[PDB]
Write a protein that binds this ligand. Structure first.
Ligand code: CLA
Ligand code: CLA
Ligand code: CLA
Ligand code: CLA
Ligand code: CLA
Ligand code: CLA
Ligand code: CLA
Ligand code: CLA
Ligand code: WVN
Ligand code: LMU
Ligand code: PQN
Ligand code: SF4
Lengths: 138, 162, 161, 107, 51, 732, 33
């Protein structure tokens, strides 16, 4: 669950932050824990200083949150970060890491989506599947 | 479109009937004044040096719009401005041109509405349909004979206007 | 003569071109003193212009109504030196060049690291190769007939059709 | 600007043939060539040239004359840079020849 | 009131009829036409923007 | 958002990309949601009806606007001095001097001077007054209404045709060859014999008297007797004044050849026999295929049976029948290629052999007609190759085409592209080398050092046609050749008189500049063919992208990986080849216009001496003929060319605008639009107004197309303004 | 020109009223849900 009462990193503000679509369509949240107070670069442009302990941040896009996660992973060795999706109705959807284990590591219970049982050169030509709802993969 | 009172609706027939009664009045009064010479400088050709290139008609002599046609058009421009303001900003009591999506359409009156004399909507619709039919008949009698429309109105009214 | 053209050695407009060039150089010559190096340079230019027009007029070149030599390239031997024989000279050189380059490529595949041979030329071996090109048609034809020039289609990479 | 400056003052560079300023006219044409050549890099993209290079590589493979260093099309950044360099060279050379021929002739 | 009041000025002072005796009448009529166009813009904006 | 109702994926787009992509895919019916083949064919049939109605409405509009605002009745009386009016001008942004300067043609109102040549065409076919022009406009309005009603009717239930009706190759071929080609040509020959030739001889024929005015004094009795040569007796005299009976003949069918000596156009009796013969030949062709009565040829058997037994073509043409019948894009490519070839043929043959009276003296009209139809030809050929590439993407079945001719094209596509590249580089290297060589040697004061190859092959062809200029003395230029004695009694005097007179464009004299510009044209044709063929044959896949057929005909790229894949689709090959097509028609029209202006000026030696180097083209054609165009308006005044003087500059503007969509790419503009979205959202008194679609940058393929459109419009408008204003300033 | 009033009537209509109504109704059609 997303604790809304987590304090935010000390930032002086910028023009690069989230627009009206964040409060109207969807917004993203990233939390992480730091061992010390240290300066990081905002993914929207500018420098902010994260506090010692937990940090909660709001963004407009998932890619901005994951860019910040990659930055703090390769520059501060922080891997406990969690990314959530928040709707205007208040429903919070946990996004990353989805099952608690990072996607580059195999975890039990994961099912393959979009896997094709042949090589890419065995896809069908369009002329078989014109005027037909058969997929080009077979 | 049809859900707002536009197209083949009873509202649009009523509005065109109102405009057609006004058109019959305006044609009769125009014929009366034009026969009687109440248009000042009716044959005066408007000059491009005063009114610009919009006054050019490119006929064979004068190459300008007559002053009488300009006066008739400006008289129509007045009621077009009235039309625009009434269409966008109607009176609270006035019948509106465009209707809201969830409106109740007026029932079609069939062959003839009930015979309610006076300032009733039935009499308004009867003379509106009559005025549209009269405009059709006047146009057809004008274009099948070569008689000008003012002269056609004067002949059909038995030279009362002039 | 051919195609209604006239020989340059009897064309009056060819003479008019020569006279116009000579007067154009002479009016520049008029503004310099005799013995000055610009005067000698201009007189040498006049001599080259006269020698070029004389040589062109006695070569059997055909001149059009413009006053310039027109080349005939339909294969007739009476103008065989105008396109056919110089082209064969190119055909001698160009077939040389590609062949020696091809030879170097076949050498370069046999080295330990071919790409270093590609950027850093083995100068004695390259000079040997550029020496080999003087008999390139017969060598290339024997390379062709022995199956060492053309490779079969089943050993060449192709895209999916 | 088109008539009294560009059209009018270019008379000197296009009638310079047969005179001492004819090199500027040649450079004028050559810059006109190279700038247009620059648009071939500027308007196009890498995949077309890479597939054409694939066909040319097939042609060189047929005669067993394919180089060991595999030919590739210029990079997208290099395509932009080459188009820009030849564009700037062409435009500056055109203005160079036009300015110099005009001002030497009339001034 | 504010925008329609200030709309008269440029049309009167810079229009094609500015050196004629009917410059103000032409400028006011042009301003009224611009007003009608902007009212049509408002109408279609309100039609497409709100339920 | 439900504007693109044919694409659910486009209709759910929250940005401005939805409107653009719905606009660009609106007529791409094959890609729509749930399109079946029968619905596809029926929509295509109705759309073809609508385009036919549009063509008829445009022609009726031309006829009406001439009958109302033209000077046709004045122009018929004096065709060689009165300037033809296209349509009237009513522009309220005009000042008075612009009203004065456009008042031409003998009328009292501003008019545009016609360059389309409709005057000469309508006058030649027998129209003389404004009344029949209006009647023709009414008839075409009625015909367009009939075809609109037919388009509606043939979509209604119990009239929608089946797929077997649409794919009936034999019936459609027989009916379109015998009736649409043959009987239409026979009826046009009938119109020429019955109406046009009597009106050319000053005798009025209309619907009120065409059943009582015989086209020939002997009537149809010589036709029914087999004494057809009576129709060849008493042709028009060389003193005949067109549109009058003075010097008129009585013949209706001759093969006299050459031109009428006054109109400088082909004899109308020759045109009537030509169209009669074309009708007879086409009806004979139109009885070839079997439809319902056992006799006739079967198309499938002809295709399968023509396999050469040596095996060099593989299986031959087996499976081409089903591939062609099932693919509308293969058919569209074949049709567009053939149409482009014949409109090129129209462009060459109509200037060389004009058929309309007094049009050879209308220099602006000839230039406009040639330029127009040649640009149409380039567009049609590019479309043919593009839709062939679409046929490879969408419709090509390899399994139905095993060892076919199409499969063998695909199996040696690399050889085809490599040899096209070789011939393109060959042509460009040596043509540019000769041109630059000539420039350098002329600049250094030595024009005698130029490399000037006489075009002796084409001169030999001209002599074979009878041109005695070059002294080749072969075929029709030989008085003892068997071809000369064979044709001496039928057509040789008129043809020899027309070909050996230097007063027309019949086989114009050619020199080294003509040689160089035809080899440049060959370079441009081969290079455009290289781009288009390489796009069509690599459309299904390449070494850089072997699964391209899974991605469709048009897509931006395959990402920066594998070295970078910009412009890899066949649509991008179309996009690159459009510039080369514009270049090729530019070179062709430059050559045509400069040669024809130098002949019309009586200064053909200027072209003969200046076309061998590029500086001659730049100075003596571009710079020299620009003077009346750039003086259409100036600080001293203005004249009737001023609009072209505007349009010229207009082209120079819009062409340049195309560059910005072709040089600058997406991410810069997308980030600018992010900045603009922030600016609008944060500005008071403007954030009360909100967009419904999110503003985004144009997509990559869309930006390529938009830059191409601005570029192409600038190309066309610049050259059209230049050619019309230059020809008018020098000659009109 | 016979019926010379027709250009001055129709050219302002075709050039200003027709495109304005076409753009307005097309805007309404493409932006409505
Ligand atoms: C608006 C009402 C109105 C009025 C007051 C008149 C009045 C007149 N009309 Mg008239 N008319 C009208 C409408 C009207 N009409 C309509 C709608 C038409 C059909 C288009 C006609 C068609 C018409 C013709 C054809 C003739 C008249 C004639 C006459 C005159 C003498 C005959 C008579 O008493 O009319 C009786 C009423 C009617 C004929 C129709 C009501 C008279 C002044 C006659 C005359 O002298 O005109 C030159 C004549 O010949 N009218
Ligand atoms: C070893 C030299 C060599 C040889 C034998 C070939 C052979 C061939 N090339 Mg190729 N090519 C080469 C180098 C070579 N190439 C290089 C270096 C380039 C890059 C500029 C190209 C670019 C190229 C293109 C773009 C095309 C060909 C084509 C062709 C074919 C037709 C001939 C032609 O058009 O030549 C023309 C050759 C050129 C325009 C480039 C030649 C560049 C120089 C002069 C050659 C290199 C010489 C080398 C430095 C000598 C060093 C050896 C020394 C150390 C001993 C043929 C298979 C064409 C094809 O597909 O036809 C079927 C074609 O379209 N080639
Ligand atoms: C004899 C009967 C007949 C005739 C006359 C036609 C006629 C036509 N059919 Mg057709 N059709 C027929 C039977 C017939 N059909 C049958 C039996 C079937 C069923 C098997 C079909 C199935 C069919 C389909 C499925 C389609 C047509 C279409 C068409 C139209 C082609 C477009 C057009 O106008 O080009 C006009 C073409 C010509 C006049 C001849 C070609 C002209 C060439 C280019 C040479 C002319 C050059 C010349 C010098 C120019 C001079 C003019 C210049 C001065 C301006 C045309 C009206 C298409 C269409 O548009 O549908 C509405 C279409 O999609 N047909
Ligand atoms: C009679 C000729 C003809 C016909 C029937 C078509 C028909 C078609 N073309 Mg084609 N085309 C033509 C000439 C023709 N074109 C020419 C001359 C060119 C060269 C300029 C092209 C270049 C071309 C390209 C590059 C593409 C098409 C595409 C299409 C398809 C969709 C068109 C679309 O959405 O535009 C709608 C346009 C508007 C509503 C604007 C008005 C459609 C089957 C496209 C397609 O979907 O194919 C896969 C496509 O990518 N064509
Ligand atoms: C004197 C001036 C001159 C100059 C500067 C050039 C310059 C050029 N020519 Mg060229 N040429 C000239 C005169 C000239 N030519 C004349 C007079 C002829 C007529 C015979 C030719 C015929 C000619 C051909 C046929 C070709 C060139 C090519 C080339 C270009 C590459 C050079 C080359 O061969 O690569 C060095 C050579 C190699 C890299 C490989 C060897 C390939 C050679 C050409 C094969 C020769 C032998 C072969 C069996 C003959 C086949 C020819 C056949 C098709 C008729 C280069 C820009 C080539 C080109 O443009 O490529 C597209 C090309 O293919 N030229
Ligand atoms: C004036 C402009 C120009 C020029 C010269 C070229 C030249 C070329 N284009 Mg091209 N192109 C252009 C504009 C131009 N393009 C534009 C604007 C577009 C639209 C985007 C295209 C689109 C296009 C496509 C899509 C294709 C080409 C192809 C080709 C090549 C073959 C055509 C040809 O004639 O071969 C002959 C080559 C030339 C005449 C080039 C000049 C050779 C020079 C003069 C040799 C001398 C070099 C010199 C010694 C270097 C010294 C410099 C040093 C001192 C720094 C050739 C390299 C095709 C290709 O690669 O075919 C194999 C191809 O597929 N182009
Ligand atoms: C496509 C054919 C075409 C074209 C380009 C023009 C062009 C022009 N006409 Mg014209 N006209 C045409 C056909 C055409 N006409 C026909 C068939 C008629 C007979 C009814 C007329 C009757 C006509 C009159 C009476 C007047 C003009 C005028 C004008 C000029 C101003 C535009 C205007 O007010 O239009 C008005 C045109 C109409 C109201 C008639 C509609 C035109 C046809 C029927 C529709 C064709 C549409 C086309 C096929 C589909 C386009 C689809 C898409 C591209 C939008 C302009 C030069 C005016 C003028 O002279 O100004 C100087 C003028 O007063 N036209
Ligand atoms: C083919 C279309 C067309 C037509 C018919 C006109 C007509 C005119 N333009 Mg023009 N214009 C056009 C396209 C057109 N323009 C385009 C595309 C541009 C952009 C480059 C311009 C830019 C332009 C400028 C910058 C100016 C004109 C001006 C003028 C007027 C000439 C001066 C005069 O005497 O008027 C005197 C002016 C009037 C009598 C005012 C007319 C007001 C109209 C009648 C009100 C109607 C409003 C609206 C249409 C109602 C319906 C709304 C609905 C469409 C939603 C004249 C009415 C000049 C002018 O005077 O305008 C103020 C001027 O300054 N035009
Ligand atoms: C790429 C794409 C993929 C698949 C689909 C696709 C549409 C097939 C394709 C697009 C393809 C392209 C567009 C194919 C279309 C291609 C081109 C335009 C074909 C040109 C043909 C010219 C013919 C052979 C004739 C000239 C006359 C000859 C016979 C004359 C000789 C003689 C005659 C009798 C008379 C006198 C002259 C002489 C010389 C004495
Ligand atoms: C065994 C079969 C032998 C051949 C049979 C068919 C031969 C051709 C038949 C043609 C059609 C019938 O022809 C029949 O009507 C024609 C039209 O009224 C007549 O033709 C007559 O009238 C025409 C119309 O004014 C005139 O143009 C003709 O000069 C005049 O001869 C033929 O003189 C008559 O024979
Ligand atoms: C033509 C072109 C190419 C092809 C250019 C090729 C790959 C490189 C040409 C370099 C040559 C080989 C060196 C200079 C050429 C000399 C005139 C002769 C070659 C000498 C040899 C011995 C090397 C691209 O790679 C490209 C990439 C991205 C956008 C546009 C384009 C683009 O327009
Ligand atoms: S630069 Fe553009 S076209 Fe090229 S790979 Fe990147 S996204 Fe694709």
């Amino acid at each position: 669950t997303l604790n809304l009462q987590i304090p935010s990193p000390t930032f002086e503000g910028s023009t690069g932050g989230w627009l009206r679509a964040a409060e109207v369509e969807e917004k993203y949240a990233i939390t992480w824990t730091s061992p010390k107070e240290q300066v990081f670069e905002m993914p929207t442009g500018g420098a902010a200083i994260m506090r010692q302990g937990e940090n909660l941040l709001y963004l407009a896009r998932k890619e901005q949150c994951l860019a910040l996660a990659t930055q703090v992973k390769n520059s501060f060795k922080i891997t406990d970060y969690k990314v959530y999706r928040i709707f205007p109705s208040g429903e919070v959807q946990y996004l990353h890491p989805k099952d608690g284990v990072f996607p580059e590591k195999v975890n039990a219970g994961r099912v393959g989506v979009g896997n094709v049982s042949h090589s890419i050169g065995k896809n069908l030509n369009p002329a078989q599947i014109k005027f037909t709802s058969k997929s080009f993969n077979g | 479109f049809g859900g707002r009172g536009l197209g083949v609706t009873v509202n649009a027939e009523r509005w065109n009937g109102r405009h057609a009664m006004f058109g019959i009045f305006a044609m009769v009064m125009t014929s009366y004044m034009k026969g009687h010479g109440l248009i000042p400088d009716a044959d005066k050709i408007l000059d491009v040096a005063q009114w610009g290139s919009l006054a050019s008609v490119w006929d064979g002599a004068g190459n300008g719009i007559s002053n009488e046609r300009a006066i008739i058009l400006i008289a129509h421009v007045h009621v077009l401005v009235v039309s625009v303001i009434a269409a966008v900003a109607p009176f609270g009591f006035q019948d509106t041109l465009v209707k809201e999506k969830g409106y109740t359409p007026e029932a079609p009156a069939g062959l003839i509405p009930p015979f309610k004399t006076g300032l009733t909507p039935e009499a308004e619709l009867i003379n509106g349909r009559l005025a549209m039919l009269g405009i059709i008949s006047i146009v057809t009698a004008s274009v099948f004979t070569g008689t000008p429309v003012v002269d056609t109105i004067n002949l059909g009214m038995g030279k009362i206007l002039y | 003569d051919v195609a209604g053209l006239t020989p340059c050695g009897e064309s009056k407009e060819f003479a008019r071109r020569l006279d116009g060039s000579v007067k154009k150089l002479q009016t520049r010559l008029k503004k310099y003193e005799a013995g000055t190096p610009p005067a000698l340079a201009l007189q040498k230019q006049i001599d080259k212009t006269k020698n070029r027009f004389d040589r062109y007029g006695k070569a059997g070149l055909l001149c059009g109504t413009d006053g310039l030599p027109h080349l005939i390239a339909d294969g007739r031997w009476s103008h065989s030196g105008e396109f056919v024989i110089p082209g064969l000279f190119f055909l001698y050189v160009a077939g040389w060049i590609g062949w020696v380059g091809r030879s170097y490529v076949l050498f370069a595949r046999t080295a330990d690291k071919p790409t270093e041979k590609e950027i850093i030329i083995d100068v004695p071996v390259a000079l040997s190769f550029v020496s080999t090109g003087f008999i390139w048609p017969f060598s290339a034809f024997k390379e062709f007939t022995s199956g060492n020039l053309i490779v079969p289609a089943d050993e060449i990479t192709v895209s999916p059709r | 600007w088109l008539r009294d400056f560009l059209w009018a003052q270019a008379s000197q560079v296009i009638q310079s043939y047969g005179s001492a300023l004819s090199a500027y006219g040649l450079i004028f044409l050559g810059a006109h060539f190279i700038w247009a050549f620059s648009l071939m890099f500027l308007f196009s993209g890498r995949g077309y040239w890479q597939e054409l290079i694939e066909s040319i590589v097939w042609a060189h493979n047929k005669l067993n004359v394919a180089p060991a260093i595999q030919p590739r099309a210029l990079s997208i950044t290099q395509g932009r840079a080459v188009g820009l360099a030849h564009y700037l060279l062409g435009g500056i050379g055109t203005t160079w020849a036009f300015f110099l021929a005009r001002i030497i002739s009339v001034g | 009131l504010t925008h329609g009041y200030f709309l008269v000025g440029p049309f009167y002072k810079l229009g094609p009829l500015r050196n004629s005796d009917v410059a103000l009448l032409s400028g006011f009529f042009s301003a009224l036409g611009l007003i009608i166009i902007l009212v049509a813009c408002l109408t279609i904006y309100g039609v497409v923007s709100f339920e | 958002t439900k504007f693109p109702k044919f694409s659910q994926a486009l209709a759910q787009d929250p940005a401005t990309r939805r409107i653009w992509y719905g606009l660009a895919t609106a007529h791409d019916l094959e890609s729509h949601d749930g399109m079946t083949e029968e619905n596809l064919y029926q929509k295509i049939f109705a759309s073809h009806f609508g385009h036919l109605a549009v063509i008829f409405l445009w022609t009726s509009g031309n006829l009406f606007h001439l009958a109302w605002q033209g000077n046709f009745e004045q122009w018929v009386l004096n065709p060689l001095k009165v300037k033809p009016i296209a349509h009237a001008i009513w522009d309220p942004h005009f000042g008075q001097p612009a009203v004065k300067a456009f008042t031409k043609g003998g009328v009292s109102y501003p008019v545009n001077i016609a360059t389309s040549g409709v005057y000469h065409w309508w006058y030649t076919i027998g129209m003389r007054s404004n009344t029949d022009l209006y009647a023709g406009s009414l008839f075409l309005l009625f015909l367009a209404g009939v075809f609109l009603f037919a388009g509606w009717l043939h979509l209604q239930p119990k009239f929608r045709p089946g797929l077997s009706w649409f794919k009936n190759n034999e019936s459609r071929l027989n009916h379109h060859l015998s009736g649409l080609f043959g009987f239409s040509s026979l009826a046009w020959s009938a119109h020429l014999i019955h109406v046009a030739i009597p009106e050319a001889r000053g005798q009025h024929v209309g619907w009120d008297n065409f059943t009582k005015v015989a086209p020939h004094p002997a009537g149809l009795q010589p036709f029914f007797s087999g004494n057809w040569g009576v129709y060849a007796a008493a042709p028009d005299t060389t003193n005949h004044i067109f549109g009058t009976s003075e010097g008129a003949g009585t013949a209706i069918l001759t093969f006299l050849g050459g031109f009428h000596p006054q109109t400088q156009a082909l004899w109308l009796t020759d045109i009537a026999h030509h169209h009669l013969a074309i009708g007879v030949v086409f009806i004979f062709a139109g009885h070839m295929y079997r439809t319902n009565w056992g006799i006739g040829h079967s198309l499938k058997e002809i295709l399968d049976a023509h396999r050469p037994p040596g095996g060099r073509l593989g299986a031959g043409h087996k499976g081409i029948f089903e591939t062609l019948t099932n693919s509308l894009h293969f058919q569209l490519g074949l049709a567009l290629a053939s149409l482009g070839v014949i409109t090129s043929l129209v462009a060459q043959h109509m200037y060389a052999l004009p058929s309309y009276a007094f049009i050879a003296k209308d220099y602006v009209t000839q230039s406009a007609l040639y330029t127009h139809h040649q640009y149409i030809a380039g567009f049609l050929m590019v479309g043919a190759f593009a839709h062939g590439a679409i046929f490879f993407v969408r419709d090509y079945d390899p399994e139905q085409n095993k060892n076919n001719v199409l499969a063998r094209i695909l199996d040696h596509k690399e050889a085809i592209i490599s040899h096209l590249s070789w011939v393109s580089l060959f042509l460009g290297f040596h043509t540019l080398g000769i041109y630059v060589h000539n420039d350098v040697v002329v600049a250094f004061g030595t024009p005698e050092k130029q490399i000037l190859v006489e075009p002796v092959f084409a001169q030999w062809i001209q002599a074979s046609s009878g041109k005695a200029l070059y002294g080749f003395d072969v075929f029709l230029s030989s008085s003892n050749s068997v071809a000369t004695n064979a044709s001496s009694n039928i057509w040789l005097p008129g043809w020899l008189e027309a070909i050996n007179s230097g007063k027309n464009s019949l086989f114009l004299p050619i020199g080294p500049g003509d040689f160089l510009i035809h080899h440049a044209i060959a370079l441009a044709l081969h290079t455009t063919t290289l781009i288009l063929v390489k796009g069509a044959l690599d459309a299904r896949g390449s070494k850089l992208m072997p699964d391209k057929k899974d991605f469709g005909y048009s897509f931006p790229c395959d990402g920066p990986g594998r070295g970078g894949t910009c412009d890899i689709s066949a649509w991008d090959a179309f996009y690159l080849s459009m510039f080369w097509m514009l270049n090729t028609i530019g070179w062709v029209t430059f050559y045509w216009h400069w040669k024809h202006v130098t002949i019309w000026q009586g200064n053909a030696g200027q072209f003969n001496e200046s076309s061998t180097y590029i500086m001659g083209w730049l100075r003596d054609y571009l710079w020299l003929n620009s003077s009346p165009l750039i003086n259409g308006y100036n600080p001293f005044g203005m004249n009737s060319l001023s609009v072209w003087s505007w349009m010229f500059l207009f082209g120079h503007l819009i062409w340049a605008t195309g560059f910005m969509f072709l040089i600058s790419w997406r991410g810069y503009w997308q980030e600018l639009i992010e900045t603009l979205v922030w600016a609008h959202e944060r500005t008071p008194l403007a954030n009360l107004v909100r967009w419904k679609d999110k503003p985004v940058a144009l997509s990559i393929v869309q930006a390529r197309l938009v830059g191409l459109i601005h570029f192409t419009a600038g190309y066309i408008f610049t050259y059209a303004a230049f050619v019309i204003a230059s020809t008018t300033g020098k000659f009109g | 020109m016979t019926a010379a009033y027709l250009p001055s009537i129709l050219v302002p209509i075709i050039g200003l009223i027709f495109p304005g109504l076409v753009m307005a109704f097309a805007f309404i059609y493409i932006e409505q849900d």
